[model samples]
Target: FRKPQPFEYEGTDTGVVLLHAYTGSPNDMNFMARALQRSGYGVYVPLFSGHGTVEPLDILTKGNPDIWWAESSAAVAHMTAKYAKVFVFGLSLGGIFAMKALETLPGITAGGVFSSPILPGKHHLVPGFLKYAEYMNRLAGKSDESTQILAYLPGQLAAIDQFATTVAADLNLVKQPTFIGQAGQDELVDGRLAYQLRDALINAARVDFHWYDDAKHVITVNSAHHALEEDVIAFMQQ
Candidate 1:
């Protein structure tokens, strides 16, 4: 498939910022963004820098949390300019950044994460990159070069883990109303991290947790999305 890009939908005063997962594209959140847009909320799904590319290594080399946060804050600033309220939500890596955004950006009214792995040592993003690069390299017949790039992946991913750890420890800084979504069968992140995240957000105005027992890691694009959609709409509206 071709690379995906950023997308936006205009609606009412409440704008929802959607962030995609690592090694995933912005289009993965399109279904949920469309649902939010239809529910009378503006939606903006911005592709992280170095993402939305054919080579996974680009994400490792150029996509740092520092840059992601810059893009995220800019997206929030853009939404705040046109709307009265802004809600930030993300999937996986995006979810990690969503919490960071809530903790650091006061302009955000509320925030949440879906299948996010915030707990330290609770994710497999390191090895996950190996599988992705090998699979993609096989298709392009570049296994040798892919192996070379992967040799340095652990160092790159370790920094991401370090970033998540910092974000998890700073959850107390997030005082906005928060939402947590977990898929019982998630393959990438420990589902139990959801509970830990809820407990850490003790200062939040409110915290809502939703458990989808049958769903997987990418809940926003799966068949059970409508259930999540309803819950998101109610949470934001209330």
Candidate 2:
């Protein structure tokens, strides 16, 4: 399996912080990183505290959403302090955290999220705890290599519950321009959450919402990605 590592691409005064999904690696955001760099925006993708290892258990033992958020928050803090304009982008769980980051970091110029679960669907099946077998199966086909680590269920479940149920309470704090994208056939998160997100960010000067009928949960890796990236690049340039 390819080892995951944090990466940065130097470009212009405008910086972009890219966040990966839960139990995912920096490679998940590599496409966006390169695209942003080509567009002359500095990019930073951080490895969450417990990721980038050979064993999935390593992630469970080392960190949770709180830890991941802390690390991402610090990265944004540094960029916002140094750059003329800083934007944040994330996918899946990372997208939820991006919303949190946007709320917490006032210096953020804009934010983008893909397939984020701002609200749970009626069928959301993740529980506070899960069987080990179930957890293994959830991530089984998601990776290409046997050595690639899987998700930490207990931690992920808790994080999802917290983000889906309470995250909207702080939406008023996210005043910057924002973009929320979701897949109509998303298996993990209900696509309707995108609308909820758009409505929640009442104070945002601009909130662009996109719904992709052809894509699934991981929009960045699917057919709609090219258009997604182009839209994000254009939005950031604006």
Candidate 3:
């Protein structure tokens, strides 16, 4: 179901999986993924369970939370089988899933958490009746009208739902060295939460924090930080 991005580099043994954020295509991670490849890592940017031009609702209706995480987990398993080491990097929601996987996978060497969302969920702004109304005001009926649901992206909403309910679960299981980036201008996911996540890690061998002033949710892409490149490369090489 996942169409893997074709690997372009050769002769490199190590690998990294660069993940795009919700509602975004592989292009979200392209800038960083390419940078990592140039730094000599084989990169896998897996299109998740309901991604890559599939209608947005299909992401919601066809898969449950477990199915979504399973896709990324499979990508990591495949990468680790072929490569000597694996490092994971993710943009936004992709970072959340990557962290969830790390909590389970024992051998991830390191993780790049860029613009990660550690909060319980999102959209406390939407009124409760409307948020859970289930297509009461849609032009079309419930299931069909869901196709036109403008405000809520079902896939992303589902992710937020999962993150909210599951936030209490232990992620201290991941022992990998972690790199987290915080974007002060980000409209989503509180930037301060990145610092909280870094501080809460019990198993992280080291935590590197990068604070960006003007960057939004996508910190590594088109940002002023060439340091993003240097830091990840140094981490992997170390």
Candidate 4:
């Protein structure tokens, strides 16, 4: 079952749109959402299409990164109309979307990305495996529940490729204040990708990069999370 639905907290003139990782539920963004809300910033975390279900493959069946981007864009648009300034923050795949929002969306005051994969990593294999599991279940004439397998529909791999290629090339489009954080011990991505992303912000008026040497892939829930929240708040208030 999905752990939680989208959440929002009412607060101040600054609105923050938080996005979670691929296959991740709203729980991933809840802690940071609370911290930002307590600091007097309005926060919203929207559930992407087909996410937060019992089966992770729901996303592939229903939509792709482009659909998620549209969902994020809608959230940003709603916040932009209500708040004096709006900021976007995300982790992992969400991080890529956050950066894209900063690049394309006007009136975004700034953005923060944590452990974004500028280059393909472990997630690249997910679609193929999911498809295989689904095929096996079908051949057995069994339900996914019976087979204990999540299914991925076709087109996801291509969509993911398009997203990675398109987003990676547009990094230079960022021109506002930006924060990029990476995990040193991440298994999915090489640490150097962080520096590559940081260096790509050629036109960003302000840029801050944080390296969490002790953390793994999901830095949001790691030991350094509180410090990461503090840094983001500090950046936002600046």
Candidate 4: clashing pairs of residues:
none
Q: In candidate 4, what are the lDDT values of residues 146-196, reduced to their tens digit?
A: 233333433565576678768779878888999988888876556677787
- Which runs in model 4 stand beyond 4 Å of their true positions? 121-158
Cα lDDT of model 1 by residue, 1-238, tens digit: 4779899999778999998888887887988998998889999999899887767778878888788878888888889888889999999888888999999876898989988858765666667777877776676766445566666677767777788899999998989999999888887788987898899998999999999999988899886688889998999988
- Candidate 1 segments exceeding 4 Å error: 138-145
What tens-digit string does per-residue lDDT give for candidate 3 at 126-219? 2322343343334233343343544445445656566634632555666777777777787666677776677777777877778778776567
**Which stretches of model 3 miss by more than 4 angstroms?**
1-11, 121-147, 150-159, 164-168
lDDT of 2 at 3: 71
Whichever of 3 and 4 has more TM-score, that candidate is 4
| After superposition, candidate 2 runs with Cα above 4 Å error | 122-155
User: Of the candidates numbered 1 and 3, which has the greater lDDT value?
Assistant: 1
The alpha-carbon lDDT assigned to residue 193 of candidate 4 equals 75
Better of 2 and 4 by lDDT: 4
Report the alpha-carbon TM-score of model 2 versus the true structure.
0.85
Q: Candidate 4: minimum summed lDDT over ten consecutive residues — where?
A: 145-154
Best model per TM-score? 1
Q: Ten-residue segment with the worst summed lDDT in candidate 2? A: 125-134
Model 1: residue 209 alpha-carbon error in angstroms: 0.5
Task: Give per-residue CA lDDT, model 2, range 1-238, as digits (tens).
Answer: 4578898887658999988876677988877788888788898999987776654555666877778878889889878877899999889778877888888767888996988856655534343112322354455543332222235454456666676466668888887899888888877667876887888889998998888887877787778888889889878877
Q: Rate residue 49 of model 3 by lDDT.
A: 56
